[PDB]
Amino acid sequence: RIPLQIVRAETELSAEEKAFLNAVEKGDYATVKQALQEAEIYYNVNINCMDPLGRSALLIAIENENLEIMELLLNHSVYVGDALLYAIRKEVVGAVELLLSYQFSEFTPDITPIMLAAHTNNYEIIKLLVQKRVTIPRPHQIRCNCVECVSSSEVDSLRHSRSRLNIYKALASPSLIALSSEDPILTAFRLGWELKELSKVENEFKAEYEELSQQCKLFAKDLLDQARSSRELEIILNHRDDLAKLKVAIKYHQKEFVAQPNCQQLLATLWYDGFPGWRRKHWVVKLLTCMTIGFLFPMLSIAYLISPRSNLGLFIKKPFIKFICHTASYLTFLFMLLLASQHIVRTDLHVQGPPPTVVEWMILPWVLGFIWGEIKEMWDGGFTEYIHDWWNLMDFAMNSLYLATISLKIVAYVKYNGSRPREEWEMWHPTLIAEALFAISNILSSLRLISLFTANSHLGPLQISLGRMLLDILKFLFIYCLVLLAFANGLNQLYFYYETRAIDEPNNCKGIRCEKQNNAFSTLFETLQSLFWSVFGLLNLYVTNVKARHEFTEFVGATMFGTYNVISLVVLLNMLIAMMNNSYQLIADHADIEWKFARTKLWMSYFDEGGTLPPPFNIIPDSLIQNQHYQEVIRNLVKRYVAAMIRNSKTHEGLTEENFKELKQDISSFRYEVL
Amino acid sequence: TIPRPHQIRCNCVECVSSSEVDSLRHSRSRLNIYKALASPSLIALSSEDPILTAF
Amino acid sequence: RIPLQIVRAETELSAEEKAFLNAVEKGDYATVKQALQEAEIYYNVNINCMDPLGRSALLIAIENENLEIMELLLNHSVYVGDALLYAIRKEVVGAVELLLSYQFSEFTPDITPIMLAAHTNNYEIIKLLVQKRVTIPRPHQIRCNCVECVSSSEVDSLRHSRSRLNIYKALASPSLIALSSEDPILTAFRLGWELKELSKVENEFKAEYEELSQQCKLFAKDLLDQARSSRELEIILNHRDDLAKLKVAIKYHQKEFVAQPNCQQLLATLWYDGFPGWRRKHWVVKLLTCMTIGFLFPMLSIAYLISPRSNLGLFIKKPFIKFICHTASYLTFLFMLLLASQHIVRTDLHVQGPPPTVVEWMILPWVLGFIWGEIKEMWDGGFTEYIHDWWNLMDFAMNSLYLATISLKIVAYVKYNGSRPREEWEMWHPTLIAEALFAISNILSSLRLISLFTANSHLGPLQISLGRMLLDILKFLFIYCLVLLAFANGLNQLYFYYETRAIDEPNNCKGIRCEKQNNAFSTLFETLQSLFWSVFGLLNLYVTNVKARHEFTEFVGATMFGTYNVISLVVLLNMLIAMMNNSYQLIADHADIEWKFARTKLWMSYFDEGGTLPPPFNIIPDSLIQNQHYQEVIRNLVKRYVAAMIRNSKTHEGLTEENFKELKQDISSFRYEVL
Ligand SMILES: CC(C)CCC[C@@H](C)[C@H]1CC[C@H]2[C@@H]3CC=C4C[C@@H](OC(=O)CCC(=O)O)CC[C@]4(C)[C@H]3CC[C@]12C
Ligand SMILES: CC(C)CCC[C@@H](C)[C@H]1CC[C@H]2[C@@H]3CC=C4C[C@@H](OC(=O)CCC(=O)O)CC[C@]4(C)[C@H]3CC[C@]12C
Ligand SMILES: [Ca+2]
Ligand SMILES: [Ca+2]
Ligand SMILES: [Zn+2]
Ligand SMILES: [Zn+2]
Ligand SMILES: [Zn+2]
């Protein structure tokens, strides 16, 4: 028996106010008029009476979209505050125009009429409001130590965050950008960048800021989509405040703008400069032409040096031929790196400091060219973006290992004279370190070729997904390294008392890299190595067996080894499978825009004159007219976009409501004509 | 008023006998009562602490 | 310049027919009347004129849902054939009633009005048609060699298939089952079973028949869902043409009907017969009670034998206690099987024919009980469903291996007298075969416990998914066995010339089960074994190396081994991963209905009196009233279902169309009143 009563009692109005509110809601030109006259004379009705469910007389008159009752209430001095916002949110032009011609609320007090109009994204209401000289407060910069931001955040943090989000939502509407900004493309780019960088700062309101940034990027892409000619697209892309706006969009990570089909057409025509209709030809003749131009890599580079402006000197200046020549030079470098480890060119293996062979003497200009190119990349173009590549770390590692190999070879040549057999050299002979670093640099140089996958149409998205899933490999190795450190600590602590010597063990071998694996858990480094190698099954089971008859210690060690194997394989590897499968499933939707953005960024790196020579040969010693043309193009694009959007806003629901309103008005007019 | 649903673990006669005589009607009545009590409007009107009532 | 003309010219009517058709379409009581009078007198208008887009005057009058023009056209002798079907498909009651009161077509000639009414599933139209004494032709049985089916399929197969599908779609409508059938539950069960079995026969029209079977099953479940009392549910489930209708639904594989919550309540109350509120208690006290009743398994079975109808004799007759006693007896059997291979009970290991030990003497009554229970299961209950279990094959294998072990032990006892050490016994000594078959039967008996997973709430759907993915394991092993046979044939053909002898090889071992693996590909059986064991990495790499210096043969053999490893692991295992992941994703939706059906089928196997004793102790020596009650229950359920369905058929579209029709009729009536 649960008793049910209204615990929050609302002060109900008198019966005289109910008649006035019912006359307002039903709609009557005479009953409301005489009710207001009686309220003026006898004071029977409070004019500012309000329903318990937040509905004043003016709000109900707005909800009925009738202008006569609204005009009479406006002339009868009804409380008009917080009533234009309801008409704006209802999105009716007549009521907003009438209220602009002159307690409880459903809107937060920081909302202005222009802000709500921008939130509702109605073109006519926003235009009619901005004609009345309205302004929006400027949101502050993200990192503020000023008093006006810090004190406001300290006093009322929720109101501050709500006000900032409301302002940024008002500024990000496509209609307000199309009306109030003279450069909607650059405004959309900038607002998308600020909203994306601000979503990470305000990590709790991340979804709304990400949605607003996506809205701005979509508006920029849709504004570019309305181009009806190649001249308009060339004017858009070449506008400088060669392809300036495309470089700006690449800077602001506008992947949807970059991967637009007409932008990709213009980039493809600029890429195949010397080949009219490269996509037209057969794949066999394309492969033959690519092979010929690649095999002509000593050519077209000497000709550039001896005659830059000849018939043949301008052949390498085209971007595709430049890319082919660079790829051919790198493949030739890797071929000589393969040839450097062969018996035909490498002899006299028992000298402490050897002079370089012919293959290494040929390798040296390539290494100097790579070093000089990476040095020039630090200066030319800039330094703040050189580290913002994530491929230049690999190049820096390659060049550092090359320099270390060269320096160690020089030291071993100048301080070691004579010959000595290789078995009696010391552990840290400079020659051995040089041969190790050269091999590591060979691995890095041959793995550098993955960056060329974005040019191909089939290996590009594959490399994009490879990066996507390496981002989760990086997360998985933290848990794996914690588990590895835990079990290594435990196993070394259990097993370090039974450490033997290399002399006692057979073949003078102490470690897990022997025929009979010895001292697998004796030291912490060897324990880490053993627990790493047990993942691939290369650690045998008898390494947990000690010389003495300590069967309890052996059993506890084998149990630790089995628990580590279970945790590190059965749980963790299949967890990694599930993680990468989920990440691949998410990225497979947006996998072609990313590849097209990466391919575009690779294409614009070959457009400029800098770095024309391959690394073998790169070490051998009025604005008003453009602004007005862009302004006409923007005017046409904005008009086309606003027309397409304004009738794409026509909806079955709104059309149906409009038809009922027109039918009701016409029936009432016909009834008044008959009566 | 709405009848109060019993506690989950009842050995009382009024619950056990009702479940024995007609189990389907008993389960339907309990589910209907708990569906009536869980509506947001009834919590907003009849309860003075809607947050704790919802919890 | 592609010329565009109408290649299929349609004979357009004269301008006099256009006026008549426009007057019919617009709606005019006077223009159509005078047009028909002029057509009667001057023969200016053909009354049966037809639009090019398949629209006669009567069809347009049907589309306008106006009965006056339809009545005048009916009185004016307009061609009425193939016009009731349009009114039925449009689903308007008045036009169908009026046309029932008296070239090109959009309907196939095998469609009758009752069949189209059943296809549209409108209750009022189906009722109004079945009141007029209509019949539906009976579809034939699935396997017909009769002339009337074979000749019709030979002359016109497409028409025959379309007619059969149309008839079965008309018979499967819920409204026709609710009206024309006195037992809608049994009719829905039977029709669902025939449609499911006919979907596999007509493998091309499989989707439609499967959809119709699902529709019938959904109708049966929804008819059961309208029960408002436990008495009605007990009347439904106990109706015999104890739980008879539940057994019928289990026979017809009605998983949705079985897994209904009220059926599961009734089954759960019948299952926990001696425990009022088993789900109420704590899990600890539940485990303690289950452990006590299980450990009392010698008890409650001797008491059943000495006093079946005592206080304690009826305790095991309850289903849950019977299940607990059976599980305890099986676990005790497995415990003695574990004890049989221990040194405490097994001694004198060098006798050719041993007498049985005490553990095997205790095992023998259990084996005889299992054999007698499986023999009784063949006779009691039936034989045609004993093979339709897929668990009785395992039981038959266990009992056959048990019988073979007993017979071999008897033979080895009666023909081998004396003692001999185990190393000089022959390869096929009967004792060794007995010990092998006993171990295989031990493996099978301990793996038999998987069938008890459906009782638990967490391991049931897991076993359902295990069966789901074993169904794809079975598909994968065909490709794997084909690849294995191919590579085994190739490797044996390459390597059989270098076969050695066991004497020449070290330790007199010839095979891959030695310390040094020898002759891995010498014979076809050993090649199959080697290629099987290479999947788990237990085949070493030096088995591809021969004694002679035939490096080309060794290289080709190693290349075959590597290709087999790549195909059988990198492609095939990850393909199997993808297949089972997809199958698990599909079955994870319908994974709880399957488990509840399996748990119900396990529960009804303990309800009957047969097999009350555990296998240790099972070898020790008026219908009119029920029909009328069921008829009242069906009447109430059908009325509730048809009310719920008939206003669930109310839709925004139909209500909106009805409101426009009423508004148009009222406005026309008001205009006629004014005029
Ligand atoms: C499988 C083994 C033999 C590979 C050995 C390494 C190289 C010989 C391969 C690896 C990556 C390959 C590259 C991957 C992608 C491309 C881009 C591709 O670009 C185009 O097709 C041009 C048109 C466009 O840019 O879309 C031209 C071949 C090339 C340089 C490939 C040349 C050959 C490379 C360097
Ligand atoms: C992990 C190792 C130690 C398992 C060794 C084998 C047995 C000791 C296990 C395997 C399967 C188990 C069974 C799995 C499922 C069930 C059903 C379960 O049923 C209930 O909970 C009763 C209520 C209901 O029917 O829903 C009772 C325990 C039982 C028989 C389990 C008893 C113990 C079993 C036989
Ligand atoms: Ca670089
Ligand atoms: Ca059985
Ligand atoms: Zn600030
Ligand atoms: Zn109670
Ligand atoms: Zn027939």
| Residue closest by Cα to atom 28 of ligand 2 | C456
* C380 contacts C610 by C-beta, under 8 angstroms: yes
Q: How many angstroms separate the CA atoms of C565 and A183, rounded?
A: 62
Measured in angstroms, how far is the CA atom of residue C311 from the centroid of ligand 2?
Answer: 28
DSSP state of C277: T
Show the ligand 1 pocket: residues with CB < 6 angstroms. A 327, 331, 449, 452-453, 455-456, 459
Tokens of A486: 């835990």
Tokens of A398: 């390659």
| Exposed/middle/buried for residue A223 (C-beta within 10 Å: 0-12, 13-18, 19+) | buried
Tokens of C132: 């007029």
Greatest Cα pair distance, chain A, in angstroms, is: 126
Tokens of A109: 């007090």
Specify the DSSP element, H or E, that contains B4: none
Q: Measure CA A488 to chain center.
A: 39
What is the SS3 string spanning A235-282?
A: HHHCCCCCCHHHHHHHHCCCHHHHCCHHHHHHHHHHHCCCCCCCCCCC
CB contact under 8 A, B25 and C269: no
Contact residues, chain C, for B28 at CB < 8 Å: 228
Contact residues, chain B, for A5 at CB < 8 Å: 46
CB contact under 8 A, C265 and B25: no
Which whole-number Å values give the CA distances from B18 to A2, C236, C370, in the listed order?
Answer: 20, 21, 44
Q: How many angstroms separate the CA atoms of C418 and A174, rounded?
A: 102
Which of the residues C230, C262, C273 would you substitute to probe the B interface, choosing the one with the greatest number of B C-beta atoms within 10 Å? C230
Q: Looking at ligand 1, which atom is closest to the CA of residue A603?
A: 25
**Which alpha helices (DSSP H) does C296-391 contain, by range?**
302-306, 319-339, 358-379
Q: How many angstroms separate the CA atoms of A159 and A152, rounded?
A: 9
Type of residue numbered A398 = M
Nearest to C665 by CA among C27, C144, C3, C15: C27
DSSP state of A503: T
| Residue closest by Cα to atom 27 of ligand 1 | A456
Q: How many angstroms separate the CA atoms of A124 and A560, rounded?
A: 73
Phi, psi of A56 (to 5 degrees): -80, 180
* A418 contacts A352 by C-beta, under 8 angstroms: yes
Resolution in A: 3.2
* A256 contacts A218 by C-beta, under 8 angstroms: yes
* C176 contacts C126 by C-beta, under 8 angstroms: yes
Locus of tokens 């909800």: A63
Give the residue before each break in chain C, using a C-to-N cut-off of over 2.5 angstroms; say none if it is continuous.
102, 241, 621
Phi, psi of C50 (to 5 degrees): -135, 135
Q: How many angstroms separate the CA atoms of A376 and B7, rounded?
A: 80
Nearest to A518 by CA among A532, A504, A528: A504
Nearest to A267 by CA among A10, A31, A596: A596
Packing angle, helices C244-251 and C184-201, rounded to 10: 10
Tokens of C549: 């210096």
Residues in contact with C429: Cβ distance below 8 Å, sequence separation at least 6, in sequence order: C352, C412
Tokens of C201: 């026969």
3-state secondary structure of C419: strand
Nearest to A79 by CA among A109, A115, A107, A105: A105
DSSP output for C472-531: HHHHHHHHHHHHHHHHHHHHHHHHGGG---TTTSGGG--SSSSSS---TTSSHHHHHHHH
Identify residues of C whose CB sits under 8 angstroms from chain B CBs: 227-231, 233, 262, 265-266, 269, 276-277, 280
Measured in angstroms, how far is the CA atom of residue C277 from the centroid of ligand 6?
Answer: 13
Tokens of A596: 């097209």
Tokens of B6: 């019993």
Distance (Å) from the alpha carbon of B20 to chain A's nearest alpha carbon: 23
* A353 contacts A417 by C-beta, under 8 angstroms: yes
Q: How many angstroms separate the CA atoms of C563 and C531, rounded?
A: 12
Q: How many angstroms separate the CA atoms of C194 and C183, rounded?
A: 17
Q: How many angstroms separate the CA atoms of C253 and C244, rounded?
A: 14
Measured in angstroms, how far is the CA atom of residue C148 from the centroid of ligand 7?
Answer: 6
Q: How many angstroms separate the CA atoms of C98 and C68, rounded?
A: 10
**Which alpha helices (DSSP H) does A308-391 contain, by range?**
319-339, 358-379
Specify the DSSP element, H or E, that contains B8: none
* C225 contacts C638 by C-beta, under 8 angstroms: no
Nearest to A219 by CA among A118, A294, A78, A342: A118
Nearest to A628 by CA among A202, A321, A182: A182
Distance (Å) from the alpha carbon of B1 to chain A's nearest alpha carbon: 5
Nearest to C585 by CA among C494, C452, C465, C490: C465
Is C225 annotated to bind ligand?
Answer: no
Is C662 annotated to bind ligand?
Answer: no
Is C374 annotated to bind ligand?
Answer: yes
3-state secondary structure of C382: coil
Measured in angstroms, how far is the CA atom of residue C393 from the centroid of ligand 4?
Answer: 8
| Residue closest by Cα to atom 21 of ligand 2 | C456
CB contact under 8 A, B46 and A8: no
What is the SS3 string spanning A593-646?
A: HHHHHHHHHHHCCCCCCCCCCCCCCCCCCCHHHHHHHHHHHHHHHHHHHHHHHH
* A36 contacts A72 by C-beta, under 8 angstroms: yes
Report the alpha-carbon angle C608-C609-C614, nearest 5.
110
Size (chain C), residues = 675
C228, C269, C280 ranked by CB distance to B23: nearest? C269
Phi, psi of A63 (to 5 degrees): -65, -25
Q: First CA to last CA across chain C, in angstroms?
A: 57
Q: Measure CA C418 to chain center.
A: 58
Ligand 2 in contact with C455 (CB < 6 A)? yes
Provide the β-strand partners of residue A2. B2
Type of residue numbered A675 = L
Residue environment code for C226-237, b if the CB has 16+ CB neighbours within 10 A, otherwise e: bbebbebbbbbb
Domain that holds residue A184: 15-269
Q: How many angstroms separate the CA atoms of C334 and A612, rounded?
A: 80
Q: How many angstroms separate the CA atoms of A524 and A492, rounded?
A: 6
Q: How many CB atoms are located within 10 Å of the residue A296 CB? A: 17
DSSP output for A333-354: HHHHHHHTTSTTT---TTBSSP
Which whole-number Å values give the CA distances from C545 to A344, A404, A553, C512, in the listed order?
Answer: 29, 43, 41, 14
Deposited experimental method? cryo-EM
CB contact under 8 A, B27 and C280: no
Phi, psi of A590 (to 5 degrees): -95, 65
Q: How many angstroms separate the CA atoms of C316 and A429, rounded?
A: 85
Which whole-number Å values give the CA distances from A470 to A474, A568, C449, in the listed order?
Answer: 6, 19, 43
Type of residue numbered A66 = N
* A83 contacts A59 by C-beta, under 8 angstroms: yes
CB contact under 8 A, B28 and C231: no
Report the alpha-carbon angle C454-C456-C462, nearest 5.
60
Residues in contact with C301: Cβ distance below 8 Å, sequence separation at least 6, in sequence order: C316, C325, C613, C614, C616, C617
B1, B37, B45 ranked by CB distance to A3: nearest? B1
Q: How many angstroms separate the CA atoms of C289 and A447, rounded?
A: 66
Q: How many CB atoms are located within 10 Å of the residue C404 CB? A: 16
Size (chain A), residues = 675
| Exposed/middle/buried for residue A346 (C-beta within 10 Å: 0-12, 13-18, 19+) | middle
Provide the β-strand partners of residue A351. A419
Phi, psi of C372 (to 5 degrees): -65, -35
Provide the β-strand partners of residue A27. none
Type of residue numbered C457 = S
Locus of tokens 């089971």: A541
DSSP state of A183: -
Q: A510: number of CA atoms within 13 Å, CB side?
A: 13
Measured in angstroms, how far is the CA atom of residue A605 from the centroid of ligand 3?
Answer: 10
Tokens of C83: 């016009």
Locus of tokens 């359920």: C637
Residues in contact with C665: Cβ distance below 8 Å, sequence separation at least 6, in sequence order: none
Q: How many angstroms separate the CA atoms of A302 and A305, rounded?
A: 5
Tokens of A245: 């706006």
Nearest to A245 by CA among A266, A269, A272, A273: A266
| Residue closest by Cα to atom 11 of ligand 2 | C449
Type of residue numbered C186 = L
Q: How many CB atoms are located within 10 Å of the residue C147 CB? A: 8
Which whole-number Å values give the CA distances from C3 to A637, C6, C7, C9, C240, in the listed order?
Answer: 35, 10, 11, 16, 74
3-state secondary structure of C151: helix
Q: How many angstroms separate the CA atoms of C202 and C165, rounded?
A: 10
Tokens of A251: 């800077």
Q: How many angstroms separate the CA atoms of C245 and C239, rounded?
A: 6
Whichever domain contains A52, its CATH number is 1.25.40.20
Provide the β-strand partners of residue C351. C419
Q: Looking at ligand 1, which atom is closest to the CA of residue A457?
A: 26
* A619 contacts A372 by C-beta, under 8 angstroms: yes
Packing angle, helices A206-224 and A184-201, rounded to 10: 160
B3, B4, B45 ranked by CB distance to A6: nearest? B45
Nearest to A360 by CA among A385, A386, A341: A341
Provide the β-strand partners of residue C56. C50
Provide the β-strand partners of residue B2. A2
* A641 contacts A222 by C-beta, under 8 angstroms: yes
